[PDB]
Amino acid sequence: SFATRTSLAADLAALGLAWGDAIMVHAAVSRVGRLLDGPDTIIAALRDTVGPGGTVLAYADWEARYEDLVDDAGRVPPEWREHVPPFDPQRSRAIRDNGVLPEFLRTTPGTLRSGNPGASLVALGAKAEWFTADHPLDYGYGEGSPLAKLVEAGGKVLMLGAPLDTLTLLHHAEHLADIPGKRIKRIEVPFATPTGTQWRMIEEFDTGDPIVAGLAEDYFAGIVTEFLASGQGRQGLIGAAPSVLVDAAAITAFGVTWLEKRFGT
Amino acid sequence: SFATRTSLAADLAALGLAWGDAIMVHAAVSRVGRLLDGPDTIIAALRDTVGPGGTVLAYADWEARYEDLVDDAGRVPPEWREHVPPFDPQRSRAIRDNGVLPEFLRTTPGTLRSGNPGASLVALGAKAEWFTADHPLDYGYGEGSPLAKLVEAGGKVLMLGAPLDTLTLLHHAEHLADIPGKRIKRIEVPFATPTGTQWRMIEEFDTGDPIVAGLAEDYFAGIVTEFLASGQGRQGLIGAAPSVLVDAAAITAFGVTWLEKRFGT
Ligand SMILES: NC[C@@H]1O[C@H](O[C@H]2[C@@H](O)[C@H](O[C@@H]3[C@@H](O)[C@H](N)C[C@H](N)[C@H]3O[C@H]3O[C@H](CO)[C@@H](O)[C@H](O)[C@H]3N)O[C@@H]2CO)[C@H](N)[C@@H](O)[C@@H]1O
Ligand SMILES: NC[C@@H]1O[C@H](O[C@H]2[C@@H](O)[C@H](O[C@@H]3[C@@H](O)[C@H](N)C[C@H](N)[C@H]3O[C@H]3O[C@H](CO)[C@@H](O)[C@H](O)[C@H]3N)O[C@@H]2CO)[C@H](N)[C@@H](O)[C@@H]1O
Known part of the structure; x- marks a missing residue:
């Protein structure tokens, strides 16, 4: 009745997760079933499967509800600046917004x-320093980003019962896609430094909506479904959760090509 | 519209929380209102109000769902032992069970x-080491426990919008109450040591139900209400949350006397 650290690691191996993998996980912990240790059983099983040479990653983002108060250029009105908690x-x-596992991993x-607040990833394992080092603060879903390092390192992404449109790596595909009409987001962000709070503007392609017009809000799930329909990736149960496992470089290139075929030239 | 670290600290001062206090908080974060930093705003405001000489405490307990499998003497069947995550x-x-603030504080x-898993408290501040040191593993709600040290240190308890029957300190009152028919709980617990997992039986008065028969499941709230009705403690808003602040020694002695008057001799 209880899914365990041992049984989940067996389900992960049967799905294709391998010794030494860098694995990024999106989880719906409720769908996994009754767990003896809650979400930490999932983290433990992932670490056991990849071993000390692997790395476990998740999309952290940042709990910053102050974006309801910014004006027109993305900056904070001066009566609110000292009240916004800076990013550490x-x-x-x-x-x-998409489960407790990232915070549990963090x-x-x-x-x-x-270091990029909105695009931050958490990493636990062999390559954690490299995955989280020198995150570019502008366009944090593109070159030199942790999502780009996951593709370069040959990492994988696991949708552990999570909705397929929560696959953060496809934002890296939107950034790379050579298409027109790509939407932009600018916002001022507070940073915590050893000398006090310092502000900075952040520019990036808007990941709060589809990269271009004409796309449904959940169009990432269709890209994943077509990817699986083409015979790529792997499906299977992790505990009681229907899960998907995909190669980071493959799904990224598939996402870029999916976009460059419907738009641009 | 946003309750802030500054405004919450002002509400805490108006309620009676003082510089240097050791404060134990039970919070219903939803009732506080819209917060710029979520639960961490509450922790920050409490720390600002008590200053570096104060201490912030919460009841941590332990997420251990394995108690559905124990037999008759509180021990774990041997087919489940290696699967139960040990206490660290x-x-x-x-x-x-009663909000995210303890875990956020932890x-x-x-x-x-x-060190006592089921009775564990978290402490942040000047006296954190003393409050959490040498927690007796048997009868962890009594002598030498962190709840006893909060009373000894002249601490306070803040019900920040939380239901009044979640006041953990009244379990210390149940332990001290010289009354008959007090119910007992025994359970085997796994501990993590530098040499591997070690098991141990835990005995204590059962805090999963009223200490004796004839009491409603929520009878702690009536004790708190009578305490406030007698002109003790303080009431007021913390953000949007109706809150209660009480002296640890006073509410403990009131709880013991409440029990010794209705039962025993
Ligand atoms: N979706 C509509 C847009 O939502 C924007 O706000 C959105 C963003 O703040 C945020 O979007 C985040 C994004 O920040 C983050 N960097 C990437 C993440 N995938 C997005 O996630 C969002 O979109 C996905 C797919 O629909 C949902 O699964 C997720 O729950 C949702 N919060 O979540 C909010 C809800 O979508 C703005 N209100 C405005 O641009 C517009 O209303
Ligand atoms: N309440 C009935 C009893 O619940 C027991 O299980 C209870 C315990 O495991 C646990 O009780 C915890 C206790 O562990 C912990 N050390 C002290 C804490 N105050 C208690 O909390 C419990 O009681 C309070 C008041 O009703 C509730 O506010 C709280 O949500 C509830 N979980 O919560 C469970 C639900 O009350 C056993 N099932 C059995 O003895 C009996 O069914």
Whole structure:
């Protein structure tokens, strides 16, 4: 009745997760079933499967509800500046819009968190320092980003019962896609430094909506479904959760080509 | 529209929380209102109000769902032993049955957590080491426990919009109450040691139900209401949350006397 650390690791191996993999996980912890240790069983099983040479990653983002108050150029009105909690990669909470597992991973001892607040990833394992180092603050879903390093390292992405449109890596595909009409987001962000709070503008392609017009809000799920329909990736149960496992470089290139075929030239 | 770290600290001062206090908080974060930093705003405001000489505490307990499998003497059947995650005071999650604030406090850098799993408290501040040191593993709600040290240190308890029957300190009153028919709980618990997992039986008065028969499940709230009705404690809003602040020694002695008057001799 209880899914365990041992049984989940067996399900992960049967799905294709391998010793030494860098694995990025999107989880719906409720769908996994009754767990003896809650979400930490999932983290433990992932670490056991990849071993000390692997790395476990998740999309952390940043719990910053102050974006309801910015004006027209993305900056904070001066009566609110001293009240917005600044971003600390070691202390700021991961966003919980898509489950508690990122925050659970972030607070696991040894986990590192990258410096771009909205695009931050958490990494736990062999390559955690490299995955989270020198995150570019502008266009943090593109070159030199942790999502680009996951593709370069030959990483994988696991949708552990999570909706397929929550696959963060496809934002890296939107960034790379050579198409016109790509939407942009600008916002001012507070950073915590050893000398006090310092502000900075952030520019990036808007990941709060489809990269261009004419796309449904959940169009990432259709891209994943077509990817699986083409015979790529792997499906199977992780505990009680229907899960999907895909290669990071493959799904990224598939996402770029999916966009460059319907738009641009 | 946004309750802030500054405005919450002002509400806490108006309620009676003082510089240097050791404060134990039970919070219903939803009732506080819209917060710029989520639960961490509450933790920050409490720390600002008590200053570096104060201490912030919460009831952590332990997320251990394995108690559905124990037999008659409280022990784990041998086919489940290696699957139960052992208790690590630095890694085990705080229970989330009564809100996320204990876990948020537990994962705040510098917070310490005591050694008795089911009765564990988290403490952040000047006296954190003393509050969490040498927690007796048997009858962890009594002598030498963190709840006893809060009374001895002249601490306070803040019900920040939380239901009044979640006041953990009244379990210390149940332990001290010289009354007959007090119910007992025994359970086997796994501990993580530098040499591997070690098991141990735990005995204590059962805090999963009223200490004796004839009491409603929520009878702590009536004790708090009578305490406030007698002109003790303080009421007021913390943000949008109706809150109660009480002296730890006073509410403990009131709880003991409440029990010794209706039962025993
Ligand atoms: N979706 C409509 C847009 O939502 C924007 O706000 C959105 C963003 O703040 C945020 O979008 C995040 C994004 O920040 C983050 N960097 C990437 C992440 N995939 C997005 O996630 C969002 O979109 C996905 C897919 O629909 C959902 O699964 C997720 O729950 C949703 N929050 O979530 C909000 C809800 O979508 C703005 N209100 C405006 O541009 C517009 O209303
Ligand atoms: N309440 C009935 C009892 O619940 C027991 O299980 C209970 C315990 O495991 C646990 O009780 C915890 C206790 O562990 C912990 N050390 C102290 C804490 N105050 C209690 O909390 C419990 O009681 C309070 C008041 O009703 C509730 O506010 C709280 O949500 C509830 N979980 O919560 C469970 C639900 O009450 C057993 N099932 C059995 O003895 C009996 O069914």
